[PDB]
Amino acid sequence: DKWKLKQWYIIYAPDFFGGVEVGLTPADDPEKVLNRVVEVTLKDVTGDFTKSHVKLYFQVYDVKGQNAYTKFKGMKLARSYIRSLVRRKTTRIDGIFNITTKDGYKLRVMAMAIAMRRIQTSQERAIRKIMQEIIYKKAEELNFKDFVLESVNGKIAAEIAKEAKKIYPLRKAEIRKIKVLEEP
Amino acid sequence: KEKWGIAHIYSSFNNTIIHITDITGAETISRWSGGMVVKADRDEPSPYAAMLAARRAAEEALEKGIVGVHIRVRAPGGSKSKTPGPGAQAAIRALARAGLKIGRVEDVTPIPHDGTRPKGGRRGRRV
Amino acid sequence: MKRRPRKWKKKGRMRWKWIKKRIRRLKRQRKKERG
Amino acid sequence: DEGYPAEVIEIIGRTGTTGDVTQVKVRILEGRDKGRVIRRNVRGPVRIGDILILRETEREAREIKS
RNA sequence: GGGACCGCCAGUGGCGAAGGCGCCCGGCUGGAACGGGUCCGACGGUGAGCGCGGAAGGCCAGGGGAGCGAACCGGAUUAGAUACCCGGGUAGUCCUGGCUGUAAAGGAUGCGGGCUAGGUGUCGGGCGAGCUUCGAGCUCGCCCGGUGCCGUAGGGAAGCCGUUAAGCCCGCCGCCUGGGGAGUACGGCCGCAAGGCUGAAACUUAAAGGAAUUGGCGGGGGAGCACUACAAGGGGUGGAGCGUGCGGU
Known part of the structure; x- marks a missing residue:
């Protein structure tokens, strides 16, 4: 029975999320735990049920015995949430x-x-240029962790909606997905 | 600290597969398909085959310390069927009544924005 | 190949497509007979 | 013979490919799912209050799509 | 790592002569509508011959090939299966240069102008009012252009059409003169070839053909029924010898 050789390891969140306890993972060797993605909802971390649909993929990158510390890899909203937000007779506007x-x-x-x-x-092009300018401005202004927290909290979305209201009122503005392409 | 697992459920119209994995999803904790439990090929996608195999995998997980589970219902996706097979919800009730704490149950169907050309030729399958 | 859509109506007829294919086959053969 | 008794509470209607089956609602009286309301198929005539004996509490009938 | 592709939004939506054209950004470029008491001065319509463009497929030379998939190779079905169904799979599909020049290339409607009830939806623009979280952001009304539906008169064999006419006028071109033989024979021109364009006759035939009504039929759909239909349940035949009739001897 291979399962009896497996041993558990505690995982943990990013420090800017307080490093809360997300769970455990069983593995045979500490090495194999490296570079492992775990998806976790925001309700698990912040405790807010109003932000359940938000989800964070953290890549496990550090192992100290039984305790595993993770890197932030990407953020994604719930597919059901996005689909419900999308409706006919309303224009989807993507800015990547x-x-x-x-x-x-x-x-x-x-x-x-x-x-x-x-x-x-x-007008869609104008709004595209708008939040492109806003997000570039904040990226220049903010460091990694602070920008991450502001993007998750929706303050960027709030500013985007408030500004783009000058072009057309927005039913909603959101940051769908974020990917960590490269670290310095 | 309670343990939580990930229950991938690939329910096709020809079979249904239930695959339990650790929170990372990288470790195969339990994995049972329709062919395990039925003898007739036509019986593989039946709700009975889905649910009883689901309960067997669930008791395996319970033996192995898992108490809660998250479900990842998968469809064929791609250019193939998007609708989950008939055994999806039946198997869901199977784990729910198997004694596990059901958590988030989400579709994980791979949906292309625009993928490859489907099978069946241009006129489709003229059955 | 100036066509007549009237021939497309299958009532008392083959499908015009295969008739065209057959006449093409015969013409190929005949032109090859002349060399 | 670990059968689960249950009591009918509502009759959905005459079902089956020949109408000899009836789709009814039944409340489980003894078993791990006591008190739960479940739709069941019944062969033979049925009245309100018939104690049916189930071999599997999990089983449910597909709704009669008119 | 790879090549294809850009959903939902997506629309009775936009644009384009047509074929056709949907990820964002940067550049180049064509066209159209709107507002214009801004310019020119009849400079226009049509178009034989001519020239350009032109889906898919195919051909020539190179590269590439994920998926799909003519051909083809297996499995199965069937009385038989060169099929429908399934497993593999060449060309092709893709980029480059060029050729071929075809379709239900259909709005089955060649194009330009003048006139002949309205209602109603949406798109782009413009104008007037009101609201506004003060963003033509939102509501309503009028004008112009395109794009749908209902439809008066009228038209038509009817289907249906009906200011986006298949209504009344004006004008240019192209095409048709019963069915088949036949888009074939012969001849010519283009094309690597495939094929493209042009196009008869002899002989045969009294119909072919278009619209719509009534029926019948549908391995179309919908509702109600049926103990000469079935379901639940009983009985009983088909076996045995005999009574009786039938076909045949």
Whole structure:
């Protein structure tokens, strides 16, 4: 029985998430735990049920005996959440950007906006340019962890909606997905 | 500290497969398909085959310290069927009544934005 | 190959496609007979 | 003969490919799922209050899609 | 690591002469509508011959080939299976240069102008009011252009059409003159070839053909029924010898 050779290892969140206890993982050797993705909802960490749909893939990168510390790899919203947000007679607006942070991290950030009705694609282009400018401005301004927290908390989405309201009222603005392309 | 697992459920129209894995998803803790339990090929995608194999995998997991589970219902996806097979919800009830704490149950179907050309030729399968 | 869509109607007829294919086959053969 | 008794509480309607089956709702009286309401197929005539004996509490009938 | 591809949004939506064209960004470039008391001065419509463009497929030379998949190789079905079904799979599908120049290339409707009830939806623009979280952001109304539906008169064999006419006028071109033989024979021109364009006759035939009504039929759909249909349940034949009738001897 191979299962009896396996031993458990505690995992942990990123420090900017407080390193809360997310769970355990069984493995035969400590080495194999390296470079392992774990998806965890935000309700697990912050305790907020209003942000359950948010999900964070953390890559396990450090092992100290039984205790595993993880890196942040990517963020994604729930597919059901996104699908419910999308509806007919409302325009989906995608803005996908490559970004270099103040501290040198490379981040691929893709964000959605959904308006009240069908809108001219020129307005969609204008809104694209808008939050591109905003996200570049914040990436220049903020370091990695702070930008991560602000992106998750939706303050970026709030600013985006408030500004883009000058172009057209938005039913919702969100940051769909984030990918850690490269670390410095 | 309670233990949580990931229950991949690949329910095709020809078979149903249930695959339990650790929180990382990289470790095969239990893995039973329809062919394990039925003798007729036509019986593989039946709800009975799904649910009883599900209960067998669930008792295996219970023997191995798992108490809660998250479910990853998978469809064929790609250019193939998107709808999960009939055994999906039946197997879901199977684990729910098997004594496990059901957590998040989410679809994980691979849905292409635009993938390869499907089978069946242009006119499709003219059965 | 100036066509007549009337021939497409299968009522009392083959499918025009295969008739065209057959006449093409015969023409190939005949032109090869002339060399 | 570990059978689960249960009591019918509602009759959904005459079902089956020949109408000799009936789709009814039944409340489990003894078993691991006591009190749970379940739709069941019944062969033979049935009235309200018939104590049926189930071999599997898990089984349920597909709804009659009219 | 690879090559194809860009859903949901997506629309009765937009654009384009047509074929056709959907990821974001940067550049180049064509066209159209709107507002214009801004310019020119009839400079226009059509188009034989001519020239350009032109889905898929195929051909020539190179590269590439994930998926799919003519051909082909196996499995199965069937009375038989050169099929429908299944497992593999060449060309092709993709980039480059060129050729071929075809379709239900259909709006089955050649194009330009003048006139002949309206209602109603949406798209782009413009104008007037009101709201506004003050963003033509939102509501409503009027004008212009395109794009749907209902439809008066009217039209048509009817289907249906009906200011986006298949209505009344004006004008240019192209095409048709019963069915088949036949888009064939012969001849010519282009094309590597495949094929493309042009195109008869002899002989045969009294119909072919289009719209719609009534029936019948549908391995179309819908509702109600049926103990000469079935379901639940009983009985009983088909075996035995005999009574009786039938076909045949």
